[PDB]
Amino acid sequence: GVSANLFVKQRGSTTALKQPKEIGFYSRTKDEEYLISDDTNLNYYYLPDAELDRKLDLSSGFQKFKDYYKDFEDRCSLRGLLETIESSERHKGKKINADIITFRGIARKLISCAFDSPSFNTVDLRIVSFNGQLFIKEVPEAVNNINQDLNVFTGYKFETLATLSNPLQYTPREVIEKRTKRIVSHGDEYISVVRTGVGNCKLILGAEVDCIFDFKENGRDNLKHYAELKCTQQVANISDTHKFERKLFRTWLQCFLVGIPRIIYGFKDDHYVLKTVEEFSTEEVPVLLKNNNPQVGSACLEAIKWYGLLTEWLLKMIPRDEDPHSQIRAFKLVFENNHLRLSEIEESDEEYSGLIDGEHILSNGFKEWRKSL
């Protein structure tokens, strides 16, 4: 097995990313089912400015909040992503041109390894080499304060109070009126698959999209219409200004990796009441951060260089075989002791059987479709 260590303080030379292009989308139901090329869980933004003065409570409905995600058998499954990829394959008839296929959050955590401690950015990934491509999947926390639960709930509550299940032109007034008593659910999501790249590496990332801001073009790339909703504590002084700058840097990285051009923030108070909403464009965030906090502003270019270096190292140190019938290899990546540690999983390991000859990393249908090519 191969073993490698990389220092997160190293910087590369890449400064730009390939323009992200949507290649597909899918919707995950509340009972862990993947509907490919289906937008039943795509929401539409509608939150008038006049509603910010209604003193909306983000703590309401917490007791009836239904977290379907925590009950999922495979919370970090790649099955829907691979099914979307495979539908695109069958549409084109040819293997898609990519080197790393993973989720947007996995890449974001890998990049933030260079700016966050392991106690904050916990990274533990399984990388499998199949058909000349790297598939990366994060193993869940698997663990199975009231304030922390409320803080996590308030983001979903804000996304419920600021979005509609159908376009505003197709929504009756009674739905909008009863929106403030709607049940907040976690687990049913809409995910868009985006082909991008950094340096010489070409990636495919699945991003959970929150809402459509303006309108949806049927059968067309919709990245420029998507928005990213986030909720955060209200800022009242310069220390909270800096805290928000770090959070805004993280969100900018998340949106920049896939090309979401709009960011919306709900600022709430100590009583979980929505104080205000602010809109950012992901293109102007680096300049704003530079003008307000240069230390975080330069972190954007540092992050792009580190992202390119990380992808180059992963492609170099992981041997890839273009033959689908070749031997599948499994590796484990962990961010610890200020280093990214990559180690091949041996046959004696208990995880080898699941990853190599099981549907833990790759579903049976995807691998048999790839073999049939």
Binding site: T15, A16, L17, K18, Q19, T196, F256, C300, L301, A303
Partner: peptide, 16 residues
């Protein structure tokens, strides 16, 4: 030379 560089997108090879 390098501090004033903003992360940007570049055109990439695509199919259709």
């Amino acid at each position: 030379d390098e501090d004033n560089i903003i992360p940007t997108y570049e055109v990439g090879d695509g199919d259709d």
